[PDB]
Amino acid sequence: NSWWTYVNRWIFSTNAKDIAILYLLFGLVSGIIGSVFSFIIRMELSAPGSQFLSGNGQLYNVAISAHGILMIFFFIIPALFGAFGNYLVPLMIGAPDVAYPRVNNFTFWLLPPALMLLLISALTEEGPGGGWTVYPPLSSITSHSGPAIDLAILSLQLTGISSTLGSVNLIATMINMRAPGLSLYQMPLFAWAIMITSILLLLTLPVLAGGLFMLFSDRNLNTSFYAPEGGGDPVLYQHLFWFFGHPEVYILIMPAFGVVSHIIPSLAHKPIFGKEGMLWAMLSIALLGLMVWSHHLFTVGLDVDTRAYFSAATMVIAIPTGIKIFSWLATLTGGAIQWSRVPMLYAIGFLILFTIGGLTGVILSNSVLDIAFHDTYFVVAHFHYVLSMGALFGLCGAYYYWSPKMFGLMYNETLASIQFWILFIGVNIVFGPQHFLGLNGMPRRIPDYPEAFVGWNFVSSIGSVISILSLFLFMYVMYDQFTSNRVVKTNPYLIPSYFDDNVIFVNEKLGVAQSIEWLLHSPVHEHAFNTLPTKSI
Amino acid sequence: DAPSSWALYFQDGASPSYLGVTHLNDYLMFYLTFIFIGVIYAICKAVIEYNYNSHPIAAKYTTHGSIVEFIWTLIPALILILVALPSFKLLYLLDEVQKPSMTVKAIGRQWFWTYELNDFVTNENEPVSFDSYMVPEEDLEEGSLRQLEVDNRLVLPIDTRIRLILTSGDVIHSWAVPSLGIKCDCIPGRLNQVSLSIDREGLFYGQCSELCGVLHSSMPIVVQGVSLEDFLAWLEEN
Amino acid sequence: HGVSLEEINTKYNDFFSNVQDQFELQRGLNNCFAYDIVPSSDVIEQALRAARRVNDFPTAVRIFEGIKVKLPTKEQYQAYVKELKPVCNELGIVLKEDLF
Amino acid sequence: SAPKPGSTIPFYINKKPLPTLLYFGTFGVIFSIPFIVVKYHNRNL
Amino acid sequence: AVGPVTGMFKRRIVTDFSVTMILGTLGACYWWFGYHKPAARQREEFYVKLAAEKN
Ligand code: HEA
Ligand code: HEA
Ligand SMILES: CCCCCCCCCCCCCCCC(=O)OC[C@H](COP(=O)(O)OCCN)OC(=O)CCCCCCCCCCCCCCC
Ligand SMILES: CCCCCCCCCCCCCCCC(=O)OC[C@H](COP(=O)(O)OCCN)OC(=O)CCCCCCCCCCCCCCC
Ligand code: CUA
Ligand SMILES: [Ca+2]
Ligand SMILES: [Mg+2]
Numbered sequence: 007n008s009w010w011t012y013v014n015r016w017i018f019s020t021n022a023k024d025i026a027i028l029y030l031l032f033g034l035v036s037g038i039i040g041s042v043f044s045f046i047i048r049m050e051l052s053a054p055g056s057q058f059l060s061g062n063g064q065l066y067n068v069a070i071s072a073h074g075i076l077m078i079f080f081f082i083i084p085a086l087f088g089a090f091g092n093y094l095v096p097l098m099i100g101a102p103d104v105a106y107p108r109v110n111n112f113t114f115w116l117l118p119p120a121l122m123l124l125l126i127s128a129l130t131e132e133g134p135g136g137g138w139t140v141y142p143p144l145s146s147i148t149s150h151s152g153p154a155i156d157l158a159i160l161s162l163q164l165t166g167i168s169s170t171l172g173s174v175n176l177i178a179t180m181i182n183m184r185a186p187g188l189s190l191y192q193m194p195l196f197a198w199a200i201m202i203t204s205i206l207l208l209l210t211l212p213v214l215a216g217g218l219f220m221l222f223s224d225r226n227l228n229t230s231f232y233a234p235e236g237g238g239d240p241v242l243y244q245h246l247f248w249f250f251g252h253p254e255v256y257i258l259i260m261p262a263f264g265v266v267s268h269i270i271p272s273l274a275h276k277p278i279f280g281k282e283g284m285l286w287a288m289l290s291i292a293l294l295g296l297m298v299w300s301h302h303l304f305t306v307g308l309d310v311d312t313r314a315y316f317s318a319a320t321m322v323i324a325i326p327t328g329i330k331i332f333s334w335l336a337t338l339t340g341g342a343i344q345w346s347r348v349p350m351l352y353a354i355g356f357l358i359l360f361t362i363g364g365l366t367g368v369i370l371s372n373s374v375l376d377i378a379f380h381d382t383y384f385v386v387a388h389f390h391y392v393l394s395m396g397a398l399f400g401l402c403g404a405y406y407y408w409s410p411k412m413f414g415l416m417y418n419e420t421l422a423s424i425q426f427w428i429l430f431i432g433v434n435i436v437f438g439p440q441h442f443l444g445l446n447g448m449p450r451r452i453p454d455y456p457e458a459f460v461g462w463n464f465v466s467s468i469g470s471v472i473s474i475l476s477l478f479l480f481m482y483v484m485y486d487q488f489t490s491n492r493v494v495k496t497n498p499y500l501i502p503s504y505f506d507d508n509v510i511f512v513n514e515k516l517g518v519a520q521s522i523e524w525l526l527h528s529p530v531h532e533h534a535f536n537t538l539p540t541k542s543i
Numbered sequence: 544d545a546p547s548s549w550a551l552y553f554q555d556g557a558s559p560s561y562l563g564v565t566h567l568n569d570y571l572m573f574y575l576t577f578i579f580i581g582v583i584y585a586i587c588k589a590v591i592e593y594n595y596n597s598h599p600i601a602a603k604y605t606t607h608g609s610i611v612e613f614i615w616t617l618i619p620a621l622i623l624i625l626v627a628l629p630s631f632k633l634l635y636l637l638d639e640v641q642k643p644s645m646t647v648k649a650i651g652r653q654w655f656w657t658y659e660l661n662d663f664v665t666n667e668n669e670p671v672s673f674d675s676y677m678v679p680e681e682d683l684e685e686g687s688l689r690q691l692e693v694d695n696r697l698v699l700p701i702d703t704r705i706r707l708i709l710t711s712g713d714v715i716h717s718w719a720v721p722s723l724g725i726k727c728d729c730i731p732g733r734l735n736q737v738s739l740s741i742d743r744e745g746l747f748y749g750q751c752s753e754l755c756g757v758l759h760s761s762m763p764i765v766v767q768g769v770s771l772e773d774f775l776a777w778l779e780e781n
Numbered sequence: 782h783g784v785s786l787e788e789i790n791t792k793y794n795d796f797f798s799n800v801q802d803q804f805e806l807q808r809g810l811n812n813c814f815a816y817d818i819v820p821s822s823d824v825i826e827q828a829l830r831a832a833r834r835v836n837d838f839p840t841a842v843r844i845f846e847g848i849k850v851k852l853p854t855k856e857q858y859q860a861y862v863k864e865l866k867p868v869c870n871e872l873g874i875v876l877k878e879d880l881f
Numbered sequence: 882s883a884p885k886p887g888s889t890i891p892f893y894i895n896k897k898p899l900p901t902l903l904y905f906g907t908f909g910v911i912f913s914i915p916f917i918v919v920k921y922h923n924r925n926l
Numbered sequence: 927a928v929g930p931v932t933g934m935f936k937r938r939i940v941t942d943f944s945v946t947m948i949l950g951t952l953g954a955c956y957w958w959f960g961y962h963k964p965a966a967r968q969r970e971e972f973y974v975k976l977a978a979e980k981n
Binding site for chain 1: 545546547548549550551552553554564567568571575578579582583585586589590593594595598599600601602603605606607608611612615616619620623626627630631633634637638688689690691713714715717719721724725726727728730731732733735750751752753754755756757758759760
Binding site: 576578589 | 942946949950953966976
């Protein structure tokens with residue numbers, strides 16, 4: 007009877023390896039639903055006027071809000087921040103298991119009920135209509151009558167508290183379970199980044215918890231927390247929300263930084279340039295990304311001195327990121343490059359998209375400049391061309407780079423490269439025309455638009471269609487990899503140097519890697535690190 | 544002033560702040576195009592020539608920054624100062640208030656816009672107010688622009704500066720016009736004070752941006768300049 | 782910083798003066814070809830003598846292949862082969878382009 | 882217990898003829914959910 | 927007795943830096959001379975014509 011063994015190995019199991027795979031699967035099943043939502047909303051705006059629908063604006067609001075919320079909180083955060091950390095951080099720190107296995111098991115299972123209740127909420131008579139950033143007066147019982155947005159508030163609350171509970175054990179694990187002789191300074195860059203995101207998320211999210219609960223209480227207890235007649239100021243709500251929203255994207259994108267800084271050296275066979283400078287600049291970014299929050303409130307009408315104070319500091323964020331990009335550029339040159347490898351392809355494509363997105367972000371960090379682009383399609387282009395080009399590319403590269411370690415299989419290089427090229431072209435021709443659409447002075451979140459905009463929407467729709475074929479090809483390649491029984495060696499990314507004999511290398515050179523995870527067999531043991539690896543003190 | 548087809552630039556407008564905004568945008572774009580093309584060429588060239596089949600030996604023994612990290616810290620920061628300064632003096636020019644002349648009110652509840660000119664209250668005791676409404680598609684005048692016209696169009700004289708008053712009594716709205724480059728938030732309870740100055744005598748277009756429910760996209764805003772005699776005739780007409 | 786340009790040349794010549802193990806020879810030979818420093822005549826000649834001593838043939842031809850790959854132009858490689866021909870003929874070394 | 886993994890952690894058995902239809906049907910329904918979602922809001926209309 | 931021959935890495939990086947610098951500078955110069963000056967000059971000419979036609 008393997009059924010008891012089945013459910014003990016999967017449900018009543020607390021091993022880190024058996025949980026990250028479920029993290030990836032949950033991320034995938036959220037991402038497919040989100041991609042179809044995005045496809046339907048982009049197909050709505052193919053041409054001006056009501057199209058495929060009876061002009062249902064509330065339905066369009068539900069669609070955009072659902073796409074945003076589910077793809078920002080059910081696709082990227084749970085499938086990148088903790089999915090590739092809980093599996094891999096114990097391997098690089100020198101520990102056999104996380105500090106608290108039971109909380110690690112608990113954190114994962116708070117998400118499925120969140121997804122079901124979010125779907126139920128979206129399946130109400132009205133559904134959430136405040137968008138990704140819901141606002142009190144719109145959310146007020148005056149507009150919505152029913153259990154539509156309350157469940158969305160609850161889902162955000164519980165997902166946030168689960169993510170906070172899913173990050174308490176990680177910090178303890180990587181602060182106390184360090185290897186003998188592994189100073190915190192000598193820690194690998196990826197775990198450095200993941201710990202920075204963990205501490206930032208835990209420090210900031212409680213504020214969201216409290217603010218969201220007090221805002222939600224307005225619908226039931228009739229509190230005057232944000233009522234215009236009750237003495238409440240919604241600018242307080244905006245300040246509370248954007249004390250969280252601004253660093254959230256950084257804590258989402260830092261794992262991409264770490265995975266890129268890990269992918270570049272091994273496939274380049276060259277050590278990373280300036281590790282200490284890079285990590286200290288990233289620490290400066292982490293500390294800096296908190297005191298700037300009011301760039302999302304530029305046209306609300308705050309005072310001149312506050313605007314200058316919180317707009318001047320927006321620029322200084324660029325300097326460490328530019329230093330990081332320059333360091334990666336320097337690392338790429340000189341050393342060998344295998345440009346044909348899929349992780350190398352994704353890492354190379356990440357840099358140009360991230361830097362152009364950063365340039366777009368530095369475009370609109372001025373109160374003098376934001377007035378022409380605030381709440382228009384230009385900010386949509388900026389934030390999309392940063393998010394879906396950095397976090398999605400990092401996730402794809404991490405999957406294609408560490409998949410043999412998760413399972414022990416080989417994918418098809420041809421199909422993977424074709425998928426990468428198709429996805430790159432589609433996402434480049436999707437968010438391209440939106441730059442012009444927002445540069446003309448046309449707002450966002452409008453199912454209908456003035457007639458002199460049809461061409462760029464038509465150009466975007468074809469790329470939106472192409473992205474769906476990219477998704478189909480990725481699904482096919484994942485299935486093929488899962489059922490191809492293609493074996494993998496211990497360290498598939500280790501090759502003999504220019505002066506290694508074919509008989510000396512095979513017998514006196516195997517079992518060497520830049521990181522610990524490649525030392526063990528690709529399907530890792532349940533109980534690894536029986537004895538602690540000891541380095542040079 | 545109005546959107547065109549296959550547009551690449553912003554538009555042709557008329558407002559003292561709009562010209563300065565366009566100038567600053569031109570300078571900032573001149574700044575960033577440099578860095579964008581430089582990084583693109585660097586990424587392309589560092590890989591197209593250094594592939595494995597042509598460079599089987601890697602100079603793995605250079606991982607120290609002697610004088611390069613310092614220049615990395617300075618030069619982009621120099622560019623940052625060079626772009627920050629003009630924006631700073633533009634903002635410090637804009638934050639001042641000129642000599643007030645008259646005010647308008649732009650209160651709007653839901654899917655319609657109400658305007659008031661209560662400066663000219665006198666013995667007649669007839670303050671002027673109306674409501675600008677979305678014109679239906681069927682009743683559009685032959686040759687009209689869909690989704691960008693109103694029935695009771697707003698009227699402001701040219702070359703006269705107005706200290707516009709922004710207020711709302713419902714869910715938050717916004718008051719935007721790309722040609723004039725002036726925007727602020729129709730936040731309920733609190734009034735937002737903004738200015739305006741039209742140089743030409745032409746029809747200007749715009750609408751709200753911050754979503755306010757199902758029909759957030761059904762309140763276009765049209766303001767057109769008029770001469771002094773036309774303005775006086777319009778005022779005495781009602 | 783650490784070693785300068787010529788100091789590592791002298792150090793690696795001194796190291797290759799006495800090597801009895803194939804693994805150590807390959808290790809030092811790898812570590813030498815990473816400083817953008819093309820070995821001098823004494824260094825390459827002593828490396829060839831060491832390869833003869835530790836009794837490994839393909840390392841000798843790999844030396845010339847790697848030097849040809851590392852050198853910037855054909856003229857420097859031609860000068861090197863002209864000045865090192867007698868050695869190769871003395872130790873029975875066959876070049877890649879003439880091997881097949 | 883000292884078992885050696887067979888490099889197979891798929892959460893469910895996979896093979897060519899039969900399981901392909903199940904996998905493709907699951908993919909199709911989880912792709913087409915938004916459809917019924919958009920149809921529900923325009924049922925009584 | 928030829929002696930060590932070095933400097934290839936620095937030569938390559940110097941050449942690549944030169945090409946990148948000149949290409950970026952030329953692109954920026956083209957943008958500055960093409961989009962700003964003609965548009966501003968045309969605006970000034972049109973405004974002068976409008977002021978003349980006013981009276
Ligand atoms: C996904 C991650 C991510 C990242 C990395 C960034 C990066 C940045 N973002 Fe962005 N941003 C978002 C996600 C992100 N943003 C989201 C989601 C929103 C919308 C919020 C919402 O409405 O929900 C948003 C919106 C947003 C706004 C709001 C505009 C509006 O709606 O009115 C502003 C304004 O300041 C801003 C600024 C910046 C800045 C200055 C950076 C900087 O980090 C960029 C720095 C990077 C570079 C500049 C490139 C590298 C640097 C060099 C090559 C050095 C040399 C450069 C020069 C000298 C030119 N972001
Ligand atoms: C997580 C960040 C994220 C991501 C990835 C996306 C992805 C996309 N978004 Fe979205 N979007 C937002 C964040 C994001 N968005 C936010 C915050 C808003 C605002 C919400 C609000 O206004 O309320 C928004 C709103 C928004 C709008 C607003 C509608 C309007 O204003 O008119 C539009 C319309 O164009 C849009 C388009 C897209 C498109 C085309 C994609 C993508 O299709 C682009 C290409 C990407 C893919 C097609 C997916 C690839 C996936 C894989 C290959 C699978 C990998 C799986 C694993 C291995 C686990 N987005
Ligand atoms: C987000 C802000 C909300 C408040 C934060 C608290 C969140 C809930 C409490 C979770 C415990 C926090 C860590 C304690 C330290 C610790 O680790 O306890 C140790 C254990 C795990 O470690 P271990 O036994 O493996 O250690 C190894 C020992 N040598 O914890 C637990 O078993 C937690 C107990 C299960 C509770 C989970 C259900 C949470 C309910 C949330 C709803 C109630 C709050 C609602 C708020 C509106
Ligand atoms: C916005 C753009 C403005 C750009 C302005 C910056 C101008 C200064 C930058 C140049 C400084 C570095 C040159 C090396 C000089 C030198 O010779 O350094 C000395 C070392 C020589 O090797 P060694 O240390 O082992 O010598 C040992 C002595 N015994 O070189 C190197 O290792 C170079 C290795 C890293 C450098 C790679 C550069 C990658 C791109 C850099 C940025 C590209 C800009 C793209 C946009 C224009
Ligand atoms: Cu009115 Cu949005
Ligand atoms: Ca439409
Ligand atoms: Mg706004």
